[model samples]
Target chain A: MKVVKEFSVCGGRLIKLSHNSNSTKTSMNVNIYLPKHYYAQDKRIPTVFYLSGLTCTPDNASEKAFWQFQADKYGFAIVFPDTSPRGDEVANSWDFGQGAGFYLNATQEPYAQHYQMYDYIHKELPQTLDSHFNDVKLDFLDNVAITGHSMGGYGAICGYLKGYSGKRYKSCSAFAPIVNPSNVPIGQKAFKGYLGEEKAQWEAYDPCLLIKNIRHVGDDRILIHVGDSDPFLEEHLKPELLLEAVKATSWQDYVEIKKVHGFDHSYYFVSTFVPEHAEFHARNLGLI
Target chain B: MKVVKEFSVCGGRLIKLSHNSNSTKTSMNVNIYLPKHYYAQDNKRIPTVFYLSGLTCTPDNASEKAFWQFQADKYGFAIVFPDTSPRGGSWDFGQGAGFYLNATQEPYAQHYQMYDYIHKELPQTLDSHFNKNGDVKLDFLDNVAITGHSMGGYGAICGYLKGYSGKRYKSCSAFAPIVNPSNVPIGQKAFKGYLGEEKAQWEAYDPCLLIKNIRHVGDDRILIHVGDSDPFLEEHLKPELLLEAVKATSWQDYVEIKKVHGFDHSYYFVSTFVPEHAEFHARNLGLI
Candidate 1:
């Protein structure tokens, strides 16, 4: 990994990095905010991974979300990963191609070779970050929390349930996530383009489906906040679907979804609830 | 003035407003964050901070990146972010690089009247529109503070000294502002294009020159923070020039400049010191 640029913000360094990704077969850009506590070595600071939404680079969340202040306050690091692979040869659709990977492994032509975002985010990126900071007592693998916005929010919920099963990630949260992707048009298009037209393949990555099967083994809660005025709320991101799916499951009472009033689907909404989410993750990470 | 959009952020409403400007003869965009206290009507009304941004910035730079929403909520005040310039052709000499001045040069003179727009028209329009709401009590004209970043930093100091004289604006602050614009290359180019080739006209708006003539009748201090590692530090923003120009004047011993370590001229630098600046303005506005 090569550090592209470094910025001093909120008593820490926002390190912008780029490196060759073996999974995507393309160069990937990532931003990591190392808080002031990372230098003090007082305790092993745990990390919270933030996956960005569609049509966004790593710069969007890093620049607009205003998470660095909360990160500094809570003494935890933040990781921002790119939403999708980018290249001339990559697919060119607005919702499914370059900027929207949907955070799943692709099985279709032209996308299968370089669209393995599931492996890149869940496994490769964490291990790579852990190796890069081996000298520092930072917890990137075991004691990590996960959160995101919109499509990245869906990725967080899917990764936390199917990838880790509540055992790997200490806590999971999201801001305006597409909870029921299988029934939505945006998800239907992305899943058909990446994972083929099989309903079985779609169900494997759907948060609504995964919640029914994955049992809540720990006391950790899944916190979610979606705006009441989000344009995509009724169509693409039906967060209420997740509540309906967990009716008879062990995870029924573990998920908390807050419908915030008068906010749209923008960083304005994400940043407003970041303080609450930071406190939530801090308590779960044993920092509070 | 009409509200283009409104988003809820940090217990405040971020209203994006647009209006046909009589000064520039073009549509202008500005963003204002009305704090929760502004709607409560339980206190002695809220004050406002007008934040001017650097060259090549819209109101969104400070609105999205500066992380001022939390501070506004913490201190019970509102924030107004005005655009750097009118939109037109070419980024360097025209549009985005307005230099926050009224132009007298040919071709550029007809459309660039940012000085009149920002200083007189914009505030009056916002005050009028906000008063129509009737429920909220906000002090847009009096009990207000002014601050900016880079070119906007120069704007804040210049505006405070020349336009307000500590009478309209309660306090003034900056982050990496071009203090001696009459001598710097970027400011010289902007001044020559906007204010013509006359050196006398350039000195009228320069902060260093303005500080010498403006008498400080109040105890309010001019707070400034500049990064040591800023790329444009020595070339464009010679903060020491302002310090030297204030010597033996009434403003002497009333200006505080802190040279921060390892920070650049980015929003990273601006957001880091926003908490301190907010506290300074809050105290000056009698909120503390």
Candidate 2:
């Protein structure tokens, strides 16, 4: 890993780390903010992966949203990956293009070769995390939290549904996450572009569909939060639809849904609940 | 008193207040950060004016410099002024230029007037402080500290020298202020555009020159901090010249100059010494 830039913020190192990803074979950037306590003794801390929404990157959450202050104070490491891979040779599209990578293996033309973020998150990301960060276990952490906004939120849920390999993430939450991407317009468009004509390929990546197929002993533990005011809540983050899918499965008793008032698909909403999300993961993963 | 916009920050009302100024007759905008303590049941506080730099703004300091959190924690009052005055008419070349004026009489230029700030601060003073009997003595309890960067430093000093009506301010200091504005290009250009071609008239506004004309002093001390690496330290700030002017009079021993090493005319330097400046003024003004 190479550090693109680093700055001292609130007594912690805010590092912009970049390295070649096996999934894309292109350089990917991640903004990492280490807690102040990490600088002190010989202890390693758990890390949380924060995925941003459309037209945004790791910088949006780390700098624009002002989350590092709280994250640093609470002694947790925040890892923010770019919305999608980008370089000179990357394919481009207006909406269902670059930044709209649905965090799944793409099977379509122009995207199938480079878009393997699911493999990256489940396999390559942990390898890179261990290669760069000497703290915590390489395969699994005692605590792992997955969070994102909009499309990234959809990815977070799907990652969890896939059993989010590395087996460390015990708590999952999202901010206006796309609960059922295979059917939603934004998801449909992106799925068609990335997964070709086979709709079945996209279904495997859909949280609403994947949850029904996977049988878990303790399925009632999943936590999800969304806002009614969010524009995409109806089609993308449909809590009712997600709950219906969960109920059809044996894991219906495990999912917990929280509907916050007056919140939207913005970092303001995400930041407000980030601490609770962190605490949720910390407690369930026994890191507390 | 018209409000352009407002937001809640750190439990304080952050208002973008705008009104027509009598000095420039121009509409001005200022960001006022009212502390949480101000809304308490019984609490009195002092107000401080933090001037932004040239080609920069009141918002730039807050957004980029990252000084508000520490300053707001140390000094529990209001921090005022805006990015810049409106342009299109005969607005000053530099951004945020009323030149921090306290003009007795001026043109109707619609967005450059700042003499009205004196009155604006007073009302905010009464509104923010704890008072019994409705007596507005402009007492020492309403401690006022002035500070700025570059041209703002000039404004801070000029505002200090002009002195508040009813003696509201207790002490004053600046960071790399344009001490001898009459000798600097920025001062010459700004004064020529606003006041027009009278070197003698500029003397009243120049801090270095103004120090020589001080008639009486009780127990007040001046603290000025400047970065040794500041490019404009010689041509603009001229602390040595300010020292000379002060030494030329009986108030030579009352002023203290702190030359910070490896610092520049940036917020990094301001952020470093801003707390000391605030605390110094708070202590001197008896607000701490």
Candidate 3:
């Protein structure tokens, strides 16, 4: 891992790191904001992982989401992982190849070479971060929370349910997530290209399908918020699909969705409610 | 004036406006955030703070990164973010590097009138639009404050001292402003290109010169905050020069400069001290 840039924000430092990823076989950039007491070693600090939306780099959320304030307020670090593995060899497309990985391991030609985002984000990234900060008392693997916006929102939910099974991430939340991607055009296209033409393979990564199979442990509720005026709300990000999929299942009463009025699918929506999400994660991490 | 985009953020509406400016003779973009209480009409209407940004920035720089929504909500005030320059094909010389000046030199003269547009036309147009219906009260003229960063910091100080004379704006502040423009390379280049070779012409818009001529009104004080680790501190933004110029002037005892440690010239530095500036302006605008 190499430090690319460092910025002092709020009561901490925002460290931008670039590392050679073993899973993807490419260099990945990640931003981590360490809170004020990070160097103090007085207490065990928890972390919240924020997954970026489509066409976004790690820098987008690090710069615009205003998460540093909440991270410092709650005394926790923030990890902003990149949207996709970026390189000249990566499949070229506006929505699929570079900036929109859909957070799934690819099974198709060309893309399958470097699109192992599922393992990269859930397992390798956390373990890398843990080893990097071995001297610190920060917990990246255990006692952590995961949340994201838009496509990343779907990634958080999918990872929380399938990867962790309510064991790793203490809490999970999303902002304008594509809850039922299999039925959406963008999701359908990405699934077809990345996971091949297998509908059963698509079901394994779909949040709507995963919600039915994965049983909830403890009070593991999924918090979600989407903007009413979001341009893609109806077409690509119909969050209501998740609510419908949970019907008669164990996850039926555990999913909470808030439809905020007049907000669009921008950082404006994600940043507006970041404080609430931070508080939620902090409480789950036993910080408050 | 036409609203290009509007987003709901932090219990407020951020309206992005674009209109043909009579001063600049070009279409200009500006952003305004109206707090939640703006439309209430039950209590006293809110005031406004005009935040000018540094060179190579649009209205979005401060809007997205400054994290002012929370502060605006806390103090019950709106915020106006104006573009740094009149953008065109020639980026380095003409567009993003406007330097917030009314150009008297030809060729570069016709389109660069940011000084007049920001100080007179922009505020008047905003005031007129909000008062067209006369249903809700929003004080854009009298009860207002001014602030900026770097070149915009220079603009804020110059505008407050020369244009307003502490009459139009209730309070003024800046973050890493270029104080002694006559002695700086960037300032000299801009002044030579915009105002011609005459040093006397440059003195008319210089904050250091304006401070000597303009008498202090009431208990008016200028609050300034600059990072100690700013890369431009030694070269372009020598904030100490402002204090040196105010040594024997009537404004000597009123200017307070807070030099923060471990901060740079990014939005991180600006957002960190926004709370302090918000409080200072709130007290002056009689909102605290």
Candidate 4:
């Protein structure tokens, strides 16, 4: 990993890093904000990985989400991962390839070559970041949490449930996530383009379908906040469907979806609720 | 005045307003954050804080990134964000180079009267626009605080010191300001273009020079914070010079310049210290 740039924010450092990814077959950009505790603490500080929405680089959340302040208050680090891979090798299309990898390992042609975002974000990225920091007093592996916005929010729930058996993430939350992708048009398009026309493949990544099978094992709950005024509320981000999916499953009553009034899909909506989510993650990560 | 947009921020509304400015002879944009107190109350007068931006900024820059809305709501005060200069943008010369000083040079002089636009005309205009409604009464005329970042930092101190005798602004503070503009290369070029090659005129606006001639007003002291790791600390933003200039002067014991460790010139540095500055201004503005 190469340190591209470093910014001092809120008694900590926001380090911008880039490295070649073995999963995506391309270079990836990520931002890690090491809270002030990382420099002064005797023990390792846990981390919270943030996946961004479409057309966003790691810098968007780093600059706009206002997470750095919350991270300092909670004594946790933040990992802002790129939404998708870059360069011409990754085909570019609106909310499809590049900048919208959908955090899924594509099985389709052209995209399959350089759009393996699922592995890059969840598997490879963490190990690389952990090793790059020389296994210092920042826990990038266990005792970590996951959260995101919009498409990134869908990715967070999917990644959390997908790794539930292994217990990859200790806590999970989201800001206006696309809860159930199978029923939404935005999800159908991206899934068909990346995962092919098979309904089974789409079911594998859909939070709604995954929740039906994954059992709730711990004293755990997923916190979610979406704005009622979000432009994409009715169409792209149908969060209610995810709530409906857990009706009779073991995960029932484990997900809290709070629809905030007078907020949109913009960073305005995301940043406003960051402090609440930060505290949620902090408590779950045993930082309280 | 036209309402460009209104956003619901932290317990307040961030109103983006644009108006035809007589000072600059062009349309000027500004953002004002009215705390929740304004909405809950019909006619309560609140204090105002004017935040001047650095180079390459619009009213939206600080409105979105500086996170002042949180502080405004905390103290029941309003914040006003004004643009850099008139037309075109630059690093040191033309547009943003107003340096909060009235220009004497031709061509540039026509659109670079930001000193009057920001400190004088902007306030009167906002008072008429918002206060005319009789409900949202913001005290733009008095009980106000002034602060800025980098070049804007220089502007804040210069304006505060120049208006000290009249008590135009009730409080003043800065983050990473170019203290002695006459000595810094960036400020020297900016002053030469905006105010011509007259060193006397430069002294009239430079904070270091202005502070030497201006006596302290009661217990009113300038609050300043400069990051020890700021890239421009030594060359362009020599805050130490302001201390030297105050020596043997009435203002010698009145300025508090805090050199924080691991901070920089970015908004990260600005937002980190904003709470402290907010408290400082709140007490001066009688919000405490």
Number of clashes recorded per candidate: 0, 13, 0, 0
Candidates 1 and 2, the one with greater lDDT = 1
lDDT of each: 0.88, 0.66, 0.88, 0.87
Query: Is 2 or 3 the stronger prediction by DockQ?
Result: 3
**Tens-digit lDDT string for candidate 2 (A1-288):** 898976555545678888998898788888887767777754456677777788887777775445555556556677888777788888775567777677878778788778877787666776687777763522234556777777888878778768744454666777777788777777788888888878877778888877887766654276777765677777666777788887756778787788876556655456556667767766654556
The prediction achieving the highest DockQ against the true structure is 3
Q: What lDDT does candidate 3 reach at residue B276?
A: 89
Q: Is model 3 an incorrect, acceptable, medium or high docking prediction?
A: high
Select the stronger candidate by lDDT from 1 and 4. 1
Question: Candidate 3's C-alpha lDDT?
Answer: 0.88
By descending DockQ, how would the candidates be arranged? 3, 1, 4, 2
Using Cα atoms, each model's DockQ against the true complex is 0.84, 0.13, 0.86, 0.64
Candidate 4: residue B176 Cα off by (Å)? 0.8
lDDT of 1 by residue, A1-288 (tens): 899999988789999999899999999999999998876643578999999999999899988887898998989999999999888766666787899999999999879999999999998999899888875588999899999999999999999988555387888999999998889999999999999988898888998887787767768689999999999999899998999999989988989999989999999888888889999999999998
Candidate 2 chain A lDDT trough over 10 residues, lowest sum: A134-143
Per-residue error at B109 for model 1, in Å?
A: 3.3
Worst ten-residue run, lDDT, model 1 chain B?
A: B87-96
Q: What is the lDDT for B276 in model 4?
A: 94
Candidate 4 residues B1-288, lDDT tens each? 789977777787778888999999998878888898887753448999999888778778777787888888899899999988886345776665578888879887788888898888999899989877764567998788999998888889989988988998999999898888888888888888888887888788877777777768689899999988888898888888888989999988888999988888888888888899999999999989
Second chain TM-score per prediction? 0.95, 0.79, 0.96, 0.96
List candidate 4 segments past 4 Å from native: A41-43, A134-136, B42-44, B88-90
